[PDB]
Design an enzyme around this catalytic site. Sequence first.
Site, PDB file in Angstrom:
ATOM      1  N   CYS A  40       0.829  -1.189   0.000  1.00 45.33           N
ATOM      2  CA  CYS A  40       0.000   0.000   0.000  1.00 45.33           C
ATOM      3  C   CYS A  40       0.873   1.252   0.000  1.00 45.33           C
ATOM      4  CB  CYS A  40      -0.936  -0.014   1.211  1.00 45.33           C
ATOM      5  SG  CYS A  40      -2.098   1.377   1.279  1.00 45.33           S
ATOM      6  N   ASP A  42       0.295   3.809   1.774  1.00 43.31           N
ATOM      7  CA  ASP A  42       0.264   4.295   3.151  1.00 43.31           C
ATOM      8  C   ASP A  42       1.674   4.637   3.626  1.00 43.31           C
ATOM      9  OD1 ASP A  42      -1.807   3.597   5.946  1.00 43.31           O
ATOM     10  OD2 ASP A  42       0.255   4.360   6.072  1.00 43.31           O
ATOM     11  N   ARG A  44       3.026   4.827   6.302  1.00 44.64           N
ATOM     12  CA  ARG A  44       3.500   4.101   7.463  1.00 44.64           C
ATOM     13  C   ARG A  44       4.007   2.715   7.090  1.00 44.64           C
ATOM     14  NH1 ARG A  44      -2.032   5.416  10.472  1.00 44.64           N
ATOM     15  NH2 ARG A  44      -2.659   4.633   8.399  1.00 44.64           N
ATOM     16  N   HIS A  96      -1.617  -4.191   4.989  1.00 46.42           N
ATOM     17  CA  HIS A  96      -1.399  -3.846   6.391  1.00 46.42           C
ATOM     18  C   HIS A  96      -2.722  -3.701   7.121  1.00 46.42           C
ATOM     19  CE1 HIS A  96      -2.376   0.546   5.969  1.00 46.42           C
ATOM     20  NE2 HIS A  96      -2.112   0.248   4.708  1.00 46.42           N
ATOM     21  N   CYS A  99      -5.830  -0.502   7.233  1.00 48.27           N
ATOM     22  CA  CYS A  99      -5.755   0.135   5.911  1.00 48.27           C
ATOM     23  C   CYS A  99      -6.990   0.977   5.615  1.00 48.27           C
ATOM     24  CB  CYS A  99      -5.563  -0.911   4.817  1.00 48.27           C
ATOM     25  SG  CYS A  99      -5.327  -0.192   3.154  1.00 48.27           S
TER      26      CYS A  99
END
Length: 209
Positions: A40, A42, A44, A96, A99
Amino acid sequence: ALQQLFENNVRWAEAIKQEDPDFFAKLARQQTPEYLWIGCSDARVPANEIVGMLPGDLFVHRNVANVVLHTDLNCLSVIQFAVDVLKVKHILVTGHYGCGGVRASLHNDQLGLIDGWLRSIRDLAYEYREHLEQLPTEEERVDRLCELNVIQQVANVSHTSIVQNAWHRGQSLSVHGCIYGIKDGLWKNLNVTVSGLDQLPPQYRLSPL
Ligand SMILES: [Zn+2]
């Protein structure tokens, strides 16, 4: 302010060159990663840091909720370059927990363009509606769907003619499903690894060229 990023970059390159002056020079000659990461976007979930890899080790695709579609030339071209040209030995499909892309597909707000991108996760939320219904909290439903999504994407990658043709010509290639905990920093194996044609349902198997 972007000057900090430029300043950071100089410091980083300079530091690496002090330890090994040839680091970048050598790397630049040929690209030879053993892994492709599909994860992803994302912020993080940065690929290299999470599994302790260096520049050169990991070919990377990141998109919203690590979605793989057989009509998407964006993701597919990364897979094909990785498998056919670089001959990576492993594809690491990593979703993750928590999400937001997955969470969005579970709810009913329109977010715009992304709505269509997340359709296939919304499909997953529908076929597992009975399973998800029997989970008390929203957080659990999101996280379970996060897992279900990864497992589905592992299937999607392994069904590509890109991957099947690699196997056909005897090329060694495994597709793994993992999930990262943004809450604990832990990258966990969902143990759904596919490494050969014999593991595909008959309806998805493609004969050689
Ligand atoms: Zn995400």
